[PDB]
Coordinates of C-alpha atoms and ligand atoms in Angstrom, one line a residue:
Chain T
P1 CA 194.8 -4.3 -81.3
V2 CA 196.1 -6.5 -84.2
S3 CA 195.2 -10.1 -84.8
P4 CA 196.4 -11.5 -88.2
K5 CA 194.6 -14.5 -89.7
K6 CA 191.2 -12.9 -89.4
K7 CA 188.1 -14.7 -90.7
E8 CA 189.6 -18.1 -89.8
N9 CA 186.5 -19.9 -88.6
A10 CA 183.7 -19.1 -91.0
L11 CA 182.4 -22.7 -91.4
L12 CA 182.1 -23.3 -87.6
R13 CA 180.0 -20.1 -87.1
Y14 CA 177.6 -21.2 -89.8
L15 CA 177.0 -24.5 -88.1
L16 CA 176.2 -22.8 -84.8
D17 CA 173.5 -20.5 -86.1
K18 CA 171.0 -22.6 -88.2
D19 CA 168.9 -25.5 -86.9
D20 CA 165.2 -26.3 -86.3
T21 CA 163.8 -28.9 -88.7
Chain L
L1 CA 157.6 -46.5 -62.1
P2 CA 156.8 -43.3 -64.0
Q3 CA 159.1 -40.3 -63.6
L4 CA 157.9 -38.5 -66.8
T5 CA 160.2 -35.6 -66.1
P6 CA 163.6 -35.0 -67.7
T7 CA 166.8 -34.6 -65.6
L8 CA 169.9 -32.7 -66.8
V9 CA 171.8 -35.9 -67.3
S10 CA 168.8 -37.6 -68.9
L11 CA 168.8 -35.0 -71.6
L12 CA 172.6 -35.2 -71.9
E13 CA 172.2 -38.9 -72.9
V14 CA 169.5 -38.6 -75.6
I15 CA 171.5 -35.9 -77.3
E16 CA 174.7 -38.0 -77.3
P17 CA 175.6 -38.4 -81.0
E18 CA 175.6 -42.0 -82.2
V19 CA 178.9 -43.6 -83.2
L20 CA 179.8 -43.1 -86.9
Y21 CA 181.9 -45.3 -89.1
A22 CA 185.0 -44.2 -91.1
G23 CA 184.0 -46.0 -94.3
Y24 CA 187.6 -47.3 -94.4
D25 CA 188.5 -49.8 -97.1
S26 CA 190.4 -52.5 -95.3
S27 CA 190.3 -54.9 -98.2
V28 CA 193.8 -53.6 -99.2
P29 CA 197.0 -53.3 -97.1
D30 CA 197.1 -50.6 -94.4
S31 CA 199.7 -47.9 -94.0
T32 CA 200.2 -45.2 -91.3
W33 CA 199.5 -42.5 -93.9
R34 CA 196.1 -43.9 -95.0
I35 CA 194.8 -44.6 -91.5
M36 CA 195.7 -41.2 -90.0
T37 CA 194.0 -39.6 -93.1
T38 CA 190.8 -41.6 -92.7
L39 CA 190.7 -40.8 -89.0
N40 CA 191.1 -37.1 -89.8
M41 CA 188.2 -37.3 -92.2
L42 CA 186.3 -39.0 -89.3
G43 CA 187.5 -36.3 -87.0
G44 CA 185.9 -33.6 -89.0
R45 CA 182.6 -35.4 -89.2
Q46 CA 182.7 -36.1 -85.4
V47 CA 183.4 -32.4 -84.7
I48 CA 180.5 -31.4 -86.9
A49 CA 178.4 -33.8 -84.9
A50 CA 179.9 -32.4 -81.7
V51 CA 178.6 -28.9 -82.8
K52 CA 175.0 -30.1 -82.9
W53 CA 175.6 -31.9 -79.6
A54 CA 177.1 -28.8 -77.9
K55 CA 174.1 -26.7 -79.2
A56 CA 171.7 -29.2 -77.5
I57 CA 173.4 -28.9 -74.2
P58 CA 171.2 -26.9 -71.8
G59 CA 172.5 -23.4 -71.5
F60 CA 175.2 -23.6 -74.1
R61 CA 173.3 -21.8 -76.8
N62 CA 172.5 -18.8 -74.5
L63 CA 176.2 -17.9 -74.2
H64 CA 177.7 -15.4 -76.6
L65 CA 178.1 -16.9 -80.1
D66 CA 181.8 -16.0 -80.0
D67 CA 182.2 -18.0 -76.8
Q68 CA 180.3 -21.0 -78.3
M69 CA 183.0 -21.0 -81.0
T70 CA 185.8 -20.4 -78.5
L71 CA 184.8 -23.4 -76.3
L72 CA 184.5 -25.8 -79.3
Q73 CA 187.8 -24.6 -80.7
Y74 CA 189.6 -24.9 -77.3
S75 CA 188.3 -28.4 -76.6
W76 CA 187.6 -30.3 -79.8
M77 CA 190.6 -32.5 -79.2
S78 CA 189.6 -33.3 -75.6
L79 CA 186.0 -34.1 -76.6
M80 CA 187.1 -36.5 -79.4
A81 CA 189.9 -38.0 -77.4
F82 CA 187.6 -38.6 -74.4
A83 CA 184.9 -40.1 -76.7
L84 CA 187.5 -42.3 -78.3
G85 CA 188.8 -43.5 -74.9
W86 CA 185.2 -44.2 -73.9
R87 CA 184.4 -46.5 -76.9
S88 CA 187.7 -48.3 -76.6
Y89 CA 187.2 -49.0 -72.9
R90 CA 183.6 -50.2 -73.6
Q91 CA 184.4 -52.2 -76.7
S92 CA 187.6 -53.9 -75.6
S93 CA 188.4 -52.9 -72.0
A94 CA 190.8 -50.2 -73.2
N95 CA 193.1 -52.7 -75.1
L96 CA 192.2 -51.5 -78.6
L97 CA 191.5 -48.0 -79.7
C98 CA 188.0 -48.1 -81.2
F99 CA 187.9 -45.0 -83.3
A100 CA 184.7 -46.4 -84.8
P101 CA 183.5 -50.0 -84.3
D102 CA 184.5 -50.9 -87.9
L103 CA 187.9 -49.2 -87.8
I104 CA 189.9 -50.5 -84.8
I105 CA 193.7 -50.1 -84.3
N106 CA 194.7 -53.7 -83.6
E107 CA 198.1 -54.9 -82.5
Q108 CA 199.3 -55.2 -86.1
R109 CA 198.3 -51.6 -87.0
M110 CA 199.6 -50.4 -83.6
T111 CA 203.1 -51.3 -84.6
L112 CA 203.1 -49.3 -87.9
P113 CA 206.0 -46.8 -88.4
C114 CA 204.5 -44.0 -86.3
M115 CA 201.2 -45.4 -84.8
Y116 CA 202.2 -45.9 -81.2
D117 CA 204.0 -42.6 -80.7
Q118 CA 200.7 -40.9 -81.0
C119 CA 198.1 -43.5 -80.0
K120 CA 199.8 -44.1 -76.6
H121 CA 198.0 -41.0 -75.1
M122 CA 194.7 -42.0 -76.6
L123 CA 195.2 -45.3 -75.0
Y124 CA 196.0 -43.5 -71.7
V125 CA 192.5 -42.0 -71.4
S126 CA 190.9 -45.3 -72.4
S127 CA 192.9 -47.1 -69.8
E128 CA 191.9 -44.7 -67.1
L129 CA 188.2 -45.1 -67.9
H130 CA 188.6 -48.8 -67.5
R131 CA 190.6 -48.5 -64.3
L132 CA 188.0 -46.3 -62.7
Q133 CA 185.1 -48.2 -64.2
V134 CA 183.4 -45.0 -65.3
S135 CA 179.6 -45.3 -65.7
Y136 CA 177.7 -43.9 -68.6
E137 CA 176.2 -41.0 -66.7
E138 CA 179.6 -40.0 -65.1
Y139 CA 181.1 -40.2 -68.6
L140 CA 178.4 -37.9 -70.0
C141 CA 178.8 -35.2 -67.3
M142 CA 182.6 -35.3 -67.6
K143 CA 182.6 -34.9 -71.4
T144 CA 180.3 -31.9 -71.1
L145 CA 182.8 -30.6 -68.5
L146 CA 185.7 -30.9 -71.0
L147 CA 183.8 -28.6 -73.3
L148 CA 184.0 -26.1 -70.5
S149 CA 187.5 -27.2 -69.4
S150 CA 189.3 -24.1 -70.7
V151 CA 188.7 -20.5 -71.7
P152 CA 190.8 -17.6 -72.9
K153 CA 192.9 -15.9 -70.2
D154 CA 190.8 -12.8 -69.7
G155 CA 187.3 -14.3 -70.1
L156 CA 184.4 -14.8 -72.4
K157 CA 181.9 -12.1 -73.2
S158 CA 179.5 -14.3 -71.1
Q159 CA 182.0 -15.5 -68.5
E160 CA 179.3 -14.9 -65.9
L161 CA 176.9 -17.5 -67.4
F162 CA 179.7 -19.8 -68.3
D163 CA 180.9 -20.4 -64.7
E164 CA 177.2 -20.8 -63.7
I165 CA 176.7 -23.6 -66.3
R166 CA 180.0 -25.2 -65.6
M167 CA 179.0 -25.2 -61.9
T168 CA 175.7 -27.0 -62.8
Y169 CA 177.6 -29.8 -64.6
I170 CA 180.2 -30.2 -61.8
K171 CA 177.2 -30.8 -59.5
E172 CA 175.7 -33.0 -62.3
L173 CA 178.9 -35.1 -62.1
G174 CA 178.4 -35.4 -58.4
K175 CA 174.8 -36.7 -58.8
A176 CA 176.0 -39.4 -61.2
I177 CA 178.6 -40.5 -58.7
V178 CA 176.2 -40.8 -55.8
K179 CA 173.7 -43.0 -57.6
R180 CA 176.3 -45.5 -59.0
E181 CA 178.5 -46.2 -55.9
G182 CA 176.6 -47.3 -52.7
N183 CA 177.9 -45.9 -49.4
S184 CA 179.1 -42.3 -49.2
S185 CA 182.8 -42.2 -48.3
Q186 CA 184.0 -43.4 -51.7
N187 CA 181.6 -40.9 -53.2
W188 CA 184.0 -38.0 -52.5
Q189 CA 187.0 -40.2 -53.4
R190 CA 185.1 -41.0 -56.6
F191 CA 184.6 -37.3 -57.3
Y192 CA 188.3 -36.7 -56.5
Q193 CA 189.5 -39.3 -58.9
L194 CA 187.0 -38.4 -61.7
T195 CA 187.9 -34.7 -61.4
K196 CA 191.6 -35.7 -61.4
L197 CA 191.0 -37.5 -64.8
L198 CA 189.5 -34.4 -66.3
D199 CA 192.5 -32.4 -65.1
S200 CA 195.0 -34.8 -66.7
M201 CA 192.9 -34.5 -69.9
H202 CA 194.6 -31.1 -70.5
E203 CA 198.0 -32.8 -70.7
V204 CA 196.9 -35.7 -73.0
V205 CA 195.3 -33.1 -75.3
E206 CA 198.5 -31.1 -75.4
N207 CA 200.5 -34.1 -76.7
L208 CA 197.7 -34.9 -79.2
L209 CA 197.7 -31.3 -80.4
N210 CA 201.4 -31.1 -80.8
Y211 CA 201.3 -34.1 -83.0
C212 CA 198.2 -32.8 -84.9
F213 CA 199.8 -29.5 -85.6
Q214 CA 203.1 -31.1 -86.6
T215 CA 201.6 -33.4 -89.2
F216 CA 199.3 -30.6 -90.3
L217 CA 202.2 -28.3 -91.1
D218 CA 204.3 -30.9 -93.0
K219 CA 203.0 -32.1 -96.4
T220 CA 206.1 -34.2 -97.0
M221 CA 204.3 -36.5 -94.7
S222 CA 201.2 -35.9 -97.0
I223 CA 198.5 -36.5 -94.3
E224 CA 195.2 -34.8 -95.2
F225 CA 192.6 -33.2 -92.9
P226 CA 189.0 -32.3 -93.8
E227 CA 187.4 -28.9 -93.8
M228 CA 186.3 -28.7 -90.1
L229 CA 189.6 -29.8 -88.7
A230 CA 191.8 -27.9 -91.1
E231 CA 189.8 -24.7 -90.3
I232 CA 190.0 -25.1 -86.6
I233 CA 193.6 -26.3 -86.5
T234 CA 194.8 -23.3 -88.5
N235 CA 193.1 -21.0 -86.0
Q236 CA 194.5 -22.6 -82.9
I237 CA 198.0 -23.4 -84.1
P238 CA 199.6 -20.1 -82.9
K239 CA 197.7 -19.0 -79.7
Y240 CA 197.9 -22.6 -78.5
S241 CA 201.5 -23.9 -78.3
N242 CA 202.8 -20.8 -76.5
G243 CA 200.5 -21.0 -73.4
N244 CA 198.4 -17.8 -73.6
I245 CA 195.3 -19.9 -72.7
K246 CA 193.9 -20.6 -69.2
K247 CA 193.3 -24.3 -68.5
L248 CA 190.7 -24.7 -65.7
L249 CA 191.6 -27.3 -63.1
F250 CA 190.0 -29.0 -60.1
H251 CA 193.3 -29.9 -58.4
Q252 CA 196.3 -27.5 -58.5
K253 CA 199.7 -29.0 -58.8
Chain E
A1 CA 205.0 -74.7 -56.2
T2 CA 205.1 -71.6 -58.5
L3 CA 202.0 -71.0 -60.5
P4 CA 200.4 -70.1 -62.9
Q5 CA 201.4 -73.1 -65.1
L6 CA 204.8 -74.5 -64.3
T7 CA 202.7 -77.6 -64.5
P8 CA 200.1 -76.6 -67.2
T9 CA 196.3 -77.0 -66.8
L10 CA 194.0 -78.4 -69.4
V11 CA 191.9 -75.2 -69.5
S12 CA 195.2 -73.3 -69.6
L13 CA 196.0 -75.1 -72.9
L14 CA 192.6 -74.2 -74.5
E15 CA 193.3 -70.6 -73.6
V16 CA 196.6 -70.5 -75.5
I17 CA 195.4 -72.4 -78.5
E18 CA 192.3 -70.3 -78.9
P19 CA 192.9 -68.8 -82.4
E20 CA 192.9 -65.0 -82.5
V21 CA 190.1 -63.0 -84.1
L22 CA 190.4 -62.4 -87.9
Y23 CA 189.3 -59.2 -89.7
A24 CA 187.1 -59.5 -92.8
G25 CA 189.1 -56.9 -94.8
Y26 CA 185.7 -55.5 -95.8
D27 CA 185.5 -52.4 -97.9
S28 CA 183.1 -50.1 -96.1
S29 CA 184.1 -47.1 -98.3
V30 CA 181.3 -48.1 -100.7
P31 CA 177.7 -48.8 -99.8
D32 CA 176.6 -52.2 -98.3
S33 CA 174.1 -54.7 -99.5
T34 CA 172.8 -58.1 -98.4
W35 CA 174.8 -59.8 -101.1
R36 CA 178.1 -58.1 -100.3
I37 CA 177.8 -58.5 -96.5
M38 CA 177.1 -62.3 -96.7
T39 CA 179.8 -63.0 -99.3
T40 CA 182.4 -61.2 -97.2
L41 CA 181.1 -63.2 -94.2
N42 CA 181.4 -66.5 -96.1
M43 CA 185.0 -65.8 -97.0
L44 CA 185.6 -64.9 -93.4
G45 CA 184.0 -68.2 -92.4
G46 CA 186.3 -70.1 -94.7
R47 CA 189.4 -68.7 -92.9
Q48 CA 187.8 -69.1 -89.5
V49 CA 187.0 -72.8 -90.3
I50 CA 190.6 -73.2 -91.5
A51 CA 191.8 -71.9 -88.1
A52 CA 189.3 -74.1 -86.3
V53 CA 191.1 -77.2 -87.8
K54 CA 194.5 -75.9 -86.5
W55 CA 192.7 -75.3 -83.2
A56 CA 191.1 -78.7 -83.0
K57 CA 194.4 -80.5 -83.6
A58 CA 195.9 -78.7 -80.6
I59 CA 193.2 -79.9 -78.3
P60 CA 194.8 -82.8 -76.3
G61 CA 193.4 -86.2 -77.4
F62 CA 191.4 -84.8 -80.4
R63 CA 193.9 -86.0 -83.0
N64 CA 194.3 -89.5 -81.4
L65 CA 190.8 -90.3 -82.7
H66 CA 190.6 -91.9 -86.1
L67 CA 191.5 -89.4 -88.7
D68 CA 188.0 -89.8 -90.2
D69 CA 186.3 -88.9 -86.9
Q70 CA 188.4 -85.8 -86.8
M71 CA 186.9 -85.0 -90.2
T72 CA 183.4 -85.9 -89.1
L73 CA 183.4 -83.8 -85.9
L74 CA 184.5 -80.6 -87.8
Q75 CA 181.9 -81.2 -90.5
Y76 CA 179.2 -81.8 -88.0
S77 CA 179.9 -78.7 -85.9
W78 CA 181.7 -76.1 -87.9
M79 CA 178.6 -74.0 -87.8
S80 CA 178.1 -74.5 -84.1
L81 CA 181.7 -73.5 -83.4
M82 CA 181.6 -70.4 -85.6
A83 CA 178.2 -69.3 -84.4
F84 CA 179.2 -69.8 -80.7
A85 CA 182.4 -68.0 -81.2
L86 CA 180.4 -65.2 -82.9
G87 CA 178.0 -64.9 -80.0
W88 CA 181.0 -64.7 -77.7
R89 CA 182.6 -61.8 -79.5
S90 CA 179.2 -60.1 -79.8
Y91 CA 178.6 -60.5 -76.0
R92 CA 182.0 -59.3 -75.1
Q93 CA 182.4 -56.5 -77.6
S94 CA 178.9 -54.9 -77.2
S95 CA 176.8 -56.8 -74.5
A96 CA 175.1 -58.9 -77.2
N97 CA 173.6 -55.7 -78.7
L98 CA 175.2 -56.1 -82.1
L99 CA 176.7 -59.0 -84.0
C100 CA 180.5 -58.7 -84.1
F101 CA 181.6 -61.1 -86.9
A102 CA 184.9 -59.2 -86.7
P103 CA 185.8 -56.3 -84.5
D104 CA 186.0 -54.2 -87.7
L105 CA 182.9 -55.7 -89.3
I106 CA 179.7 -55.1 -87.1
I107 CA 176.1 -55.7 -88.2
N108 CA 174.7 -52.4 -86.8
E109 CA 171.2 -51.2 -86.7
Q110 CA 171.5 -50.0 -90.3
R111 CA 172.8 -53.3 -91.7
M112 CA 170.4 -55.3 -89.5
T113 CA 167.5 -53.6 -91.2
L114 CA 168.6 -54.8 -94.7
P115 CA 166.3 -57.3 -96.5
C116 CA 167.2 -60.9 -95.4
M117 CA 169.8 -59.9 -92.8
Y118 CA 167.6 -60.0 -89.7
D119 CA 166.0 -63.4 -90.4
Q120 CA 169.5 -64.8 -90.5
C121 CA 171.3 -62.8 -87.8
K122 CA 168.3 -63.4 -85.5
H123 CA 169.5 -66.9 -84.5
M124 CA 173.0 -65.7 -84.1
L125 CA 172.0 -62.8 -81.7
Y126 CA 170.2 -65.4 -79.6
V127 CA 173.4 -67.2 -78.6
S128 CA 175.1 -63.9 -77.9
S129 CA 172.2 -62.7 -75.7
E130 CA 172.3 -66.1 -73.9
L131 CA 176.0 -65.8 -73.2
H132 CA 175.4 -62.2 -71.8
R133 CA 172.3 -63.3 -69.8
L134 CA 174.3 -66.0 -68.0
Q135 CA 177.5 -64.0 -67.8
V136 CA 179.6 -66.7 -69.2
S137 CA 183.2 -66.6 -68.2
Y138 CA 186.1 -67.0 -70.7
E139 CA 187.2 -70.3 -69.2
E140 CA 183.7 -71.8 -69.2
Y141 CA 183.4 -70.5 -72.7
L142 CA 186.6 -72.3 -73.8
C143 CA 185.3 -75.6 -72.4
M144 CA 181.8 -75.2 -73.8
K145 CA 183.1 -74.5 -77.3
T146 CA 185.3 -77.6 -77.1
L147 CA 182.2 -79.6 -76.1
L148 CA 180.5 -78.2 -79.2
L149 CA 183.1 -79.9 -81.4
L150 CA 182.1 -83.1 -79.7
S151 CA 178.4 -82.4 -79.7
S152 CA 177.3 -84.4 -82.7
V153 CA 178.4 -87.9 -83.8
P154 CA 177.2 -90.4 -86.4
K155 CA 174.2 -92.8 -85.8
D156 CA 176.8 -95.6 -85.5
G157 CA 179.3 -93.7 -83.4
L158 CA 182.9 -93.1 -84.6
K159 CA 185.8 -95.3 -85.3
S160 CA 187.3 -94.3 -82.0
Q161 CA 184.1 -94.0 -79.9
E162 CA 185.6 -95.3 -76.7
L163 CA 188.2 -92.6 -76.9
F164 CA 185.6 -90.0 -78.0
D165 CA 183.4 -90.4 -74.9
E166 CA 186.5 -90.3 -72.8
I167 CA 187.6 -87.0 -74.3
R168 CA 184.0 -85.6 -74.0
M169 CA 183.7 -86.6 -70.4
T170 CA 187.1 -85.0 -69.8
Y171 CA 185.8 -81.7 -71.0
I172 CA 182.5 -82.0 -69.3
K173 CA 184.5 -82.1 -66.1
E174 CA 186.7 -79.3 -67.3
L175 CA 183.5 -77.2 -67.7
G176 CA 182.6 -78.1 -64.1
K177 CA 186.0 -77.0 -62.9
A178 CA 185.5 -73.6 -64.7
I179 CA 182.2 -73.1 -63.0
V180 CA 183.6 -73.9 -59.6
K181 CA 186.7 -71.7 -60.2
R182 CA 184.4 -68.8 -61.3
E183 CA 182.9 -68.6 -57.8
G184 CA 183.4 -69.5 -54.2
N185 CA 179.8 -70.3 -53.3
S186 CA 179.1 -73.9 -54.2
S187 CA 175.4 -73.4 -53.5
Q188 CA 174.5 -72.9 -57.1
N189 CA 177.4 -74.7 -58.8
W190 CA 175.0 -77.4 -60.1
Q191 CA 172.4 -74.9 -61.1
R192 CA 174.9 -73.1 -63.3
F193 CA 176.1 -76.3 -64.8
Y194 CA 172.5 -77.0 -65.7
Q195 CA 172.1 -73.6 -67.4
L196 CA 175.4 -73.8 -69.4
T197 CA 174.8 -77.4 -70.5
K198 CA 171.2 -76.4 -71.4
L199 CA 172.6 -73.7 -73.6
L200 CA 174.9 -76.2 -75.3
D201 CA 171.9 -78.4 -76.1
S202 CA 170.1 -75.4 -77.6
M203 CA 173.0 -74.8 -80.0
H204 CA 171.7 -77.8 -82.0
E205 CA 168.5 -76.0 -82.5
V206 CA 170.2 -72.7 -83.6
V207 CA 172.7 -74.6 -85.8
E208 CA 169.8 -76.3 -87.6
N209 CA 168.2 -72.9 -88.5
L210 CA 171.5 -71.3 -89.5
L211 CA 172.4 -74.4 -91.5
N212 CA 169.0 -74.6 -93.3
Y213 CA 169.7 -70.9 -94.2
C214 CA 173.3 -71.9 -95.2
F215 CA 172.3 -74.6 -97.6
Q216 CA 169.3 -72.7 -99.2
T217 CA 171.7 -69.9 -100.0
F218 CA 174.5 -72.1 -101.2
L219 CA 172.1 -73.9 -103.6
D220 CA 170.8 -70.8 -105.3
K221 CA 173.0 -69.2 -108.0
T222 CA 170.1 -66.7 -108.5
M223 CA 171.1 -65.2 -105.2
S224 CA 174.7 -64.9 -106.2
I225 CA 176.4 -65.3 -102.8
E226 CA 179.8 -66.9 -102.9
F227 CA 181.2 -69.4 -100.5
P228 CA 185.0 -70.0 -100.2
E229 CA 186.7 -73.3 -101.1
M230 CA 186.7 -74.5 -97.5
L231 CA 183.0 -73.9 -96.8
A232 CA 181.8 -75.0 -100.2
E233 CA 183.3 -78.5 -99.8
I234 CA 181.9 -78.9 -96.3
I235 CA 178.4 -77.7 -97.3
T236 CA 178.3 -80.0 -100.3
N237 CA 179.7 -82.6 -97.9
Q238 CA 177.1 -82.5 -95.2
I239 CA 174.2 -81.2 -97.3
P240 CA 173.0 -84.7 -98.2
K241 CA 173.0 -86.3 -94.8
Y242 CA 172.1 -83.2 -92.8
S243 CA 168.5 -83.9 -93.6
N244 CA 167.8 -87.7 -94.0
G245 CA 168.6 -88.3 -90.3
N246 CA 172.2 -89.7 -90.2
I247 CA 173.6 -87.5 -87.4
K248 CA 172.9 -88.2 -83.7
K249 CA 172.8 -85.0 -81.7
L250 CA 174.2 -85.5 -78.2
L251 CA 172.4 -83.7 -75.4
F252 CA 173.1 -83.1 -71.7
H253 CA 169.4 -83.0 -71.0
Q254 CA 166.6 -84.9 -72.6
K255 CA 163.2 -83.5 -71.4
Chain K
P1 CA 178.1 -101.8 -97.0
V2 CA 179.3 -98.7 -98.7
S3 CA 181.3 -95.7 -97.6
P4 CA 180.2 -93.0 -100.1
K5 CA 182.3 -90.4 -98.3
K6 CA 185.1 -91.1 -100.8
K7 CA 185.8 -87.7 -102.3
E8 CA 184.0 -85.1 -100.2
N9 CA 186.7 -82.7 -98.8
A10 CA 190.2 -83.9 -99.5
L11 CA 191.1 -80.4 -98.4
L12 CA 190.2 -80.9 -94.7
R13 CA 191.8 -84.4 -94.7
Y14 CA 194.9 -82.7 -96.1
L15 CA 194.7 -79.9 -93.5
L16 CA 194.5 -82.3 -90.5
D17 CA 197.8 -84.2 -91.3
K18 CA 201.0 -82.1 -90.9
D19 CA 201.9 -79.4 -88.3
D20 CA 205.4 -79.8 -86.9
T21 CA 207.6 -76.8 -88.1
Ligands
DEX1 C1 197.8 -38.0 -82.8 C2 196.7 -37.2 -83.4 C3 195.5 -37.2 -82.5 C4 194.4 -37.7 -83.4 C5 192.9 -37.5 -83.1 C6 192.6 -37.8 -81.7 C7 191.1 -37.7 -81.4 C8 190.3 -38.3 -82.5 C9 189.3 -39.2 -82.1 C10 188.5 -39.9 -83.1 O1 187.6 -40.6 -82.8 C11 188.8 -39.7 -84.5 C12 189.7 -38.8 -84.9 C13 190.5 -37.9 -83.9 C14 190.1 -36.5 -84.1 C15 192.0 -38.2 -84.2 F1 192.2 -39.5 -84.0 C16 192.5 -38.0 -85.6 O2 192.1 -36.7 -86.1 C17 194.0 -38.0 -85.9 C18 194.8 -37.2 -84.8 C19 194.6 -35.7 -85.1 C20 196.3 -37.5 -84.8 O3 196.5 -38.9 -85.0 C21 197.1 -36.8 -85.9 O4 197.6 -35.7 -85.7 C22 197.2 -37.4 -87.3 O5 197.5 -36.4 -88.2
DEX2 C1 172.7 -67.6 -92.0 C2 174.0 -68.3 -92.4 C3 174.8 -68.6 -91.2 C4 176.1 -67.8 -91.5 C5 177.4 -68.1 -90.7 C6 177.2 -68.3 -89.2 C7 178.5 -68.6 -88.5 C8 179.6 -67.6 -89.0 C9 180.3 -66.9 -88.0 C10 181.3 -65.9 -88.4 O1 182.0 -65.4 -87.6 C11 181.6 -65.7 -89.9 C12 180.9 -66.4 -90.8 C13 179.9 -67.5 -90.4 C14 180.5 -68.8 -90.9 C15 178.5 -67.2 -91.2 F1 178.2 -66.0 -90.7 C16 178.6 -66.9 -92.7 O2 179.3 -68.0 -93.3 C17 177.3 -66.8 -93.4 C18 176.3 -67.8 -93.0 C19 176.7 -69.2 -93.6 C20 174.9 -67.5 -93.4 O3 174.6 -66.2 -93.2 C21 174.5 -67.8 -94.9 O4 174.4 -69.0 -95.2 C22 174.4 -66.7 -95.9 O5 175.3 -67.0 -97.0
BOG3 C1 171.6 -88.8 -66.0 C2 172.8 -87.9 -66.4 C3 173.6 -88.4 -67.6 C4 174.2 -89.8 -67.4 C5 175.2 -90.1 -68.6 C6 175.9 -91.4 -68.4 C7 177.2 -91.4 -69.2 C8 177.1 -91.3 -70.7 C9 178.2 -90.1 -72.2 O1 176.9 -89.6 -72.5 C10 176.7 -89.7 -73.9 C11 175.3 -90.2 -74.4 O2 174.8 -89.4 -75.4 C12 177.8 -89.4 -75.0 O3 177.6 -89.4 -76.3 C13 179.2 -89.1 -74.4 O4 180.3 -88.7 -75.2 C14 179.4 -89.4 -72.9 O5 180.6 -89.0 -72.2
BOG4 O1 186.0 -93.4 -67.7 C1 184.6 -93.2 -67.7 O2 183.8 -94.1 -68.4 C2 182.7 -93.5 -69.1 C3 182.6 -93.6 -70.6 O3 181.7 -92.7 -71.1 C4 181.8 -92.6 -68.3 O4 180.4 -92.4 -68.6 C5 182.4 -91.8 -67.1 O5 181.7 -91.1 -66.1 C6 184.0 -92.0 -66.9 O6 184.7 -91.1 -66.2
BOG5 C1 185.0 -81.5 -62.4 C2 184.6 -80.5 -61.3 O1 184.1 -81.2 -60.2 C3 182.8 -80.6 -59.9 O2 181.9 -80.3 -60.9 C4 180.9 -79.3 -60.6 C5 180.5 -78.2 -61.6 O3 179.9 -77.1 -60.9 C6 180.3 -79.3 -59.2 O4 179.1 -78.6 -58.9 C7 181.1 -79.9 -58.0 O5 180.6 -80.1 -56.7 C8 182.5 -80.5 -58.4 O6 183.4 -80.9 -57.4

């Protein structure tokens, strides 16, 4: 159903995807 | 003496992020406002470090990405509060809150206008770690457990794997206990007490969150929060306070 | 009758007169540097020495010695006292892993790797590691530090020597009482007394190194490293005779 | 003989003589 305040944790997701070095 | 084989707790230790400093200018008078603000800045950097930490935890990355965010969102305060208590207990026997070895809340700062009202709970966890004389390995396992201390009431898209991982670390906490004690009776008592500390963590977090949200939603106070914390706080604010979240416990009240 | 202290103990006195730790008020918001770290530490040293004077005057019998001896003792062991206290806070605050000049100012791995920092800190870490290795109790520590104040006298004694030796022997005994109190097994009471007293003797050797490094820096405007009013006068004071052989270093063991 | 100490640190001397309050 509804869930206002969407796209609230964009930064966190980014940090969880990358990595390797 | 050559084990040359990593254990689950051995890997949990090498990935433990190193303590970071707040780069606080203490050459000028303190003030509640400035300290809370510097600590918030430090909080964001610690949570960011907590992300790389969580990602290195065996089994965490193989959970749905959404759940990875859920867990970190649902326990960022517990993880930081627990880490803080740990350093305080280690550095000064839980007498001083050691947010970072260079920024410590001494008795003088503890008496500031609003310092104690909020620090008392941080001190609580620090006190308990001292009381129980928690070892490093036990501490490591417990902290991992806090990351898996609560989930949304319904489940995670990978709940199946979640409970499996959580189980593994509960048993990991058991192993730490057995090789620190010496006997066997006080092993289960140990487990009882340690798991009891984790349970109470939920309550200490609740009080810290209330305060965090309060100061976050009142700029007359003027306290600032960095990107990481601001982003997370705004997300949690509503769903949290109500009580639409399931807090996992080892001992039911 | 009722106790603790309704009839105070000598070591009980030392505990209450122990000055509390001071914070350097260092600005860590901007990058560090050998020059800035040291200067901040010297200023801190000035205030710590000032507190040492107030501390010394509260030590029963100390200020019954000729006023000049009071001045001599502090000038002859301000480094030993400060370095010993440093090692103590380092040992207690981080198992002698780091140097805790102040609970808010710690010479971490990053600062330890600076240019001249390790060659200096090296000797300081030694005393901390030693306190950690021997698991020195707070009480034994209080007595030992007091003994450090009375660890070096002139080559012709003091103007109140008779009283001095009496005070020193009084605290040597106090140290022994701390050792006995700390344990129930008297088996190795004398063995521990040997270790602790041996450590005290070694302080002379670490002080010498820290001091040579203190004078060399003081006398080098090229290095631009400030010393407060307090330290400046004491360094310029001792600097001449802390070389020619005017001071007699008291030792518990000769060997 | 000669006591050349005359000068060196009147600050400490001062500090060691007055604590009542
Ligand atoms: C009482 C709360 C609880 C506090 C936090 C508790 C956990 C924590 C541990 C640290 O090692 C550094 C910062 C944090 C992450 C924190 F200390 C700061 O952020 C300030 C904080 C939110 C708080 O003081 C405020 O709400 C001030 O706005
Ligand atoms: C190596 C020496 C020995 C140092 C001192 C050792 C004892 C000490 C302990 C402290 O808790 C604070 C400052 C002092 C009192 C000190 F750390 C500083 O003054 C700097 C010092 C003189 C020194 O680093 C220098 O001479 C560089 O200027
Ligand atoms: C063999 C064990 C030591 C015997 C010591 C005899 C008593 C002396 C003595 O020793 C000193 C000599 O340096 C002092 O300077 C003192 O202050 C003191 O109390
Ligand atoms: O008084 C005393 O006289 C002395 C003076 O140093 C000693 O060496 C003692 O052992 C002692 O207790
Ligand atoms: C003054 C305390 O007296 C003593 O000093 C010691 C220090 O350990 C001993 O080993 C003793 O046997 C003792 O009674």
